[PDB]
Amino acid sequence: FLENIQIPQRASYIRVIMLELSRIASHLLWLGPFMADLGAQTPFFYIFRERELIYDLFEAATGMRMMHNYFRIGGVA
Amino acid sequence: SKLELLKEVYGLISILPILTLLLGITIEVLVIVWLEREISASIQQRIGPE
């Protein structure tokens, strides 16, 4: 974004999908543990069962489990 | 004669039923911990202590 290697708007929308899924990746990994801190004793494993699908997504997208190396320089991986 | 005590040496008490209660309560402790570790962590989870 600094040296202006023009990122297409389609790849930009792909990155938007990424970012708005990471919003979920944060919402779960807070609320679940937040439920396990506030007093909600049972739903701990519940939110992990919900999150299981994001694991398959991050795996099949670019990387092993955290989707590592989904951002190259001239676009994405 | 009856110098100190004829029938009162040690033969008036039996410790069988007390030990049966001990065995029963220990077995029931096993049952209840099995109940816990197999129902609490298995409502929406995997099986307990397999």
From Swiss-Prot, chain B:
Coiled coil spans: none
Membrane-spanning residues: 15-35
Location(s), subcellular: Plastid, Chloroplast thylakoid membrane
Domain of life the protein comes from: Eukaryota
Described function: NDH shuttles electrons from NAD(P)H:plastoquinone, via FMN and iron-sulfur (Fe-S) centers, to quinones in the photosynthetic chain and possibly in a chloroplast respiratory chain. The immediate electron acceptor for the enzyme in this species is believed to be plastoquinone. Couples the redox reaction to proton translocation, and thus conserves the redox energy in a proton gradient.
Subunit structure: NDH is composed of at least 16 different subunits, 5 of which are encoded in the nucleus.
Entry similarity comment: Belongs to the complex I subunit 1 family.
Name assigned to this protein: NAD(P)H-quinone oxidoreductase subunit 1, chloroplastic
Annotated source species: Hordeum vulgare (Barley)
